[PDB]
């Protein structure tokens, strides 16, 4: 079982920039035939894997000159030279030398931009959900960049570790940013027992986390 390992997990660049994504093999991948079967696939959003390179360097029928496969043994590197607006997606190495054929980790090829802070907003539960009994306090941390960011909930000064389900936007299309929601869900009775609810956004664009809250 050859564990395919790729680097980096995420690779952001500008348009027209060169990218060099790399794959690593736990075991060599020269099949008996006398050839290494390193394969590079490109999966776009909600699509299937487009073979790009084969047998290490053989770019498939139609994939551009831009896409080049390198390598020998366990180490291989695919490399674009003028990133066009359609190369973005999750790149994947593969291998058909052994059994079972393993699929690399996936290197997400994205856009790079000016780091920007989030626009935190905090909303208490609504009246109706509140009758229903549940209580969901939501926090949008929209439009920040880079994607790394961490929101902490704090009920009555105290940090609330559980009850939160998060959900991430992909690179915003209009501007290459990212956005995200963090929802804490107690029951009417839990929510009821408290006063203050804070949602601290901590983005690398600052030292002191961005804070918002509300009482009842």
């Amino acid at each position: 079982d050859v564990l395919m390992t790729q680097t980096p997990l995420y690779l952001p660049v500008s348009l027209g920039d060169q990218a060099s994504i790399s794959c690593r093999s736990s075991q060599t991948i020269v099949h008996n035939n006398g050839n290494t079967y390193l394969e590079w696939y490109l999966q776009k959003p909600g699509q299937s894997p487009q073979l790009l390179i084969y047998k290490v360097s053989n770019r498939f029928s139609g994939v551009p000159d831009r896409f080049s496969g390198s390598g020998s043994g366990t180490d291989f590197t695919l490399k674009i030279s003028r990133v066009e607006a359609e190369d973005l997606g999750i790149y994947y190495c593969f291998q058909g030398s052994h059994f079972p054929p393993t699929f690399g980790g996936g290197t997400k090829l994205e856009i790079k931009r000016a780091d920007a802070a989030p626009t935190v907003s905090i909303f208490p539960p609504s009246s109706e959900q509140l009758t229903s009994g549940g209580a969901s306090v939501v926090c949008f941390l929209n439009n920040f960049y880079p994607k790394d960011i961490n929101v902490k909930w704090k009920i009555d000064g105290s940090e609330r570790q559980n009850g939160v389900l998060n959900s991430w936007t992909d690179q915003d299309s209009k501007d290459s940013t990212y956005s995200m929601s963090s929802t804490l869900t107690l029951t009417k009775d839990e929510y009821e027992r408290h006063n203050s609810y804070t949602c601290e956004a901590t983005h690398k664009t600052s030292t002191s986390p961005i804070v918002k809250s509300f009482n009842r």
Partner: protein, 135 residues
């Protein structure tokens, strides 16, 4: 012009059984064994196995060695992937692929994918709540 048109989505429930198709176009369907790959939501690109289109002899990767089944109809040129005792973990997107008579593997032509979804839930409509500013 070789195409590998698959089946539409399937909202199954834990335990139920499901069979999935993969119609093969423009090539000798019995001269290239079909392959099935699994892709768990958000990534996880795993390999299910293959079935020899000639003998029908299936080959499963250690882990899909339990409830998965491979079968085919030659008088249509359609492969099938079935799953039994259906678990939650099974939800994901399954693709059928094939090579180009290279002995070592090169999954060249893939299926568009057919998602299989597992959930106890029976079609239930969303409750809507307005997020008016509170602060």
């Amino acid at each position: 012009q070789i195409q590998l048109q698959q089946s539409g989505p399937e909202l199954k429930k834990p335990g139920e059984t499901v069979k999935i198709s993969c119609k093969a176009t423009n090539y000798a369907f019995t001269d290239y064994s079909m392959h099935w790959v699994k892709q768990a939501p958000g990534g996880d690109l795993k390999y299910v196995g293959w079935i020899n289109t000639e003998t029908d002899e299936p080959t499963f990767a250690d882990d899909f060695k339990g409830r998965f089944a491979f079968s085919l109809d030659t008088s249509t040129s359609t492969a099938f992937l079935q799953i039994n005792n259906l678990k939650n973990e099974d939800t994901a997107t399954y693709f059928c692929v094939r090579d180009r008579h290279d002995y070592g593997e090169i999954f060249t032509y893939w299926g568009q994918g057919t998602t299989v979804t597992v959930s106890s839930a029976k079609t239930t409509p969303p409750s809507v709540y307005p997020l008016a500013p509170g602060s």
